[PDB]
Write a protein that binds this ligand. Structure first.
Ligand SMILES: *[C@@H]1O[C@H](CO)[C@@H](O[C@@H]2O[C@H](CO)[C@@H](O)[C@H](O)[C@H]2NC(C)=O)[C@H](O)[C@H]1NC(C)=O
Ligand SMILES: *[C@@H]1O[C@H](CO)[C@@H](O[C@@H]2O[C@H](CO)[C@@H](O)[C@H](O)[C@H]2NC(C)=O)[C@H](O)[C@H]1NC(C)=O
Ligand SMILES: *[C@@H]1O[C@H](CO)[C@@H](O[C@@H]2O[C@H](CO)[C@@H](O)[C@H](O)[C@H]2NC(C)=O)[C@H](O)[C@H]1NC(C)=O
Ligand SMILES: *[C@@H]1O[C@H](CO)[C@@H](O[C@@H]2O[C@H](CO)[C@@H](O)[C@H](O)[C@H]2NC(C)=O)[C@H](O)[C@H]1NC(C)=O
Ligand SMILES: *[C@@H]1O[C@H](CO)[C@@H](O)[C@H](O)[C@H]1NC(C)=O
Lengths: 105, 96, 50, 49
């Protein structure tokens, strides 16, 4: 249904035929980032629930794959599977905990 | 002599517009896009992604978590390599 | 044979029909190849370190 | 004939490219659906009156 990620389509009648107006989403203005498969925190490997880990050079974030929206790496958007000894390419970074300021205050 | 006999009576074989080299080049371009960029190149600009992360995305596509790909990366790579070698042997060894 | 061609001309546009049909098939084969293989407009290349 | 513009993708083991914007693209696809409905009187065509 068109070139790109298909959103919707509109039919138009034509003599002996149909013309489809395919409305698609095309990514643009891509930017390079340093990526890692997992984040090693406290001896545990954290993997993104729905996104991908990206780094702008100094800080690590997790973002959705098809649009750049960097977010802080927390336990809400990552899941823990295993220790840090198996994943090839795992990098060391902190993983924030939302409950940590709550019980502290 | 079959080709000459056909040619003599006015039957001609027109050459294909795309040569085998250019079709091979197109397949090479598709392979390079699918290896370095995953499925992004087919939907817009080619976005580079490491191949294990691409394979983890594909694992998510079939409903398996990415940790399964990362933890078993060497086993998956070995299985894929073995299957590719078997494919070459299977094509070379079967007439039909 | 010129006599055969003169007799053949009485049958009309059969020869034109056959040439047109074969020409359509011939262009169709090239179109098939373009549809299947020419699906990218950029010739991508693999990195040197494979 | 040139097949396409030459592009080398910067593949590396730890670099990714993330889109930061989008384009809403509308494209046309034209498909034939029907032909002209023709009926032929066989007797009149071959023999007339
Ligand atoms: C990577 O992103 C982070 C977060 O956006 C940047 O850190 C901020 O940088 C701005 C401008 O340098 C500062 O005003 C903020 O105070 C920083 N915040 C924190 C929490 O450090 C970081 O500079 C970016 N790195 C690069 C190389 O662009
Ligand atoms: C990521 O963090 C871990 C834990 O802090 C590091 O592992 C330690 O590395 C030091 C120096 O190489 C060793 O003396 C320790 O024995 C290691 N501890 C464990 C539990 O393995 C690891 O080196 C860090 N990786 C990176 C790339 O910084
Ligand atoms: C991501 O970074 C790579 C390398 O830093 C960029 O690739 C270079 O692109 C320029 C311009 O086309 C070429 O002249 C170089 O030869 C490329 N280098 C390599 C190693 O391929 C790439 O353009 C960057 N991506 C974006 C979106 O800016
Ligand atoms: C995303 O791209 C759109 C265009 O596709 C950008 O919108 C343009 O912004 C410039 C500068 O602000 C304006 O001069 C143009 O008139 C805008 N075009 C349209 C169609 O609105 C937008 O700024 C981009 N956003 C980001 C974050 O890159
Ligand atoms: C990472 O990539 C470079 C070139 O792309 C390669 O030379 C290197 O061997 C790779 N890393 C490992 C651990 O193989």
């Amino acid at each position: 249904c068109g070139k790109g990620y298909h959103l919707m389509s509109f039919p138009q009648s034509a003599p002996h035929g149909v013309v489809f107006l395919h409305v698609t989403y095309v990514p643009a203005q891509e930017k390079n980032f340093t990526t890692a498969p997992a984040i090693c925190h406290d001896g545990k490997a954290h993997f993104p629930r729905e996104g991908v880990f990206v780094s702008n050079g100094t800080h690590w974030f997790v973002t959705q794959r098809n649009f750049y929206e960097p977010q802080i790496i927390t336990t809400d958007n990552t899941f823990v599977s295993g220790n840090c000894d198996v994943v090839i390419g795992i990098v060391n970074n902190t993983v924030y905990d939302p409950l940590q300021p709550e019980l502290d205050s | 002599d079959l080709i000459c006999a056909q040619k003599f009576n006015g039957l001609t074989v027109l050459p294909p517009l795309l040569t085998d080299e250019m079709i091979a080049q197109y397949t090479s371009a598709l392979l390079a896009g699918t290896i370095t960029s995953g499925w992004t190149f087919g939907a817009g600009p080619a976005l580079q992604i490491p191949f294990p992360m691409q394979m983890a995305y594909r694992f998510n596509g079939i409903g398996v978590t990415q940790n399964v790909l990362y933890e078993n990366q060497k086993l998956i790579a070995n299985q894929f390599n073995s299957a590719i070698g078997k494919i070459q042997d299977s094509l070379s060894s079967t007439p039909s | 044979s010129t006599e055969c061609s003169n007799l053949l001309l009485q049958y009309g546009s059969f020869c034109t029909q056959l040439k047109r049909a074969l020409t359509g098939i011939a262009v169709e084969q090239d179109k098939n190849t373009q549809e299947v293989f020419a699906q990218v407009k950029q010739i991508y290349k693999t990195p040197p370190i494979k | 004939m040139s097949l396409g513009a030459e592009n080398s993708v910067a593949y590396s083991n730890n670099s990714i490219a993330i889109p930061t914007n989008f384009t809403i693209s509308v494209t046309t696809e034209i498909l034939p659906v029907s032909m002209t409905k023709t009926s032929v009187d066989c007797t009149m065509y071959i023999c007339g009156d």
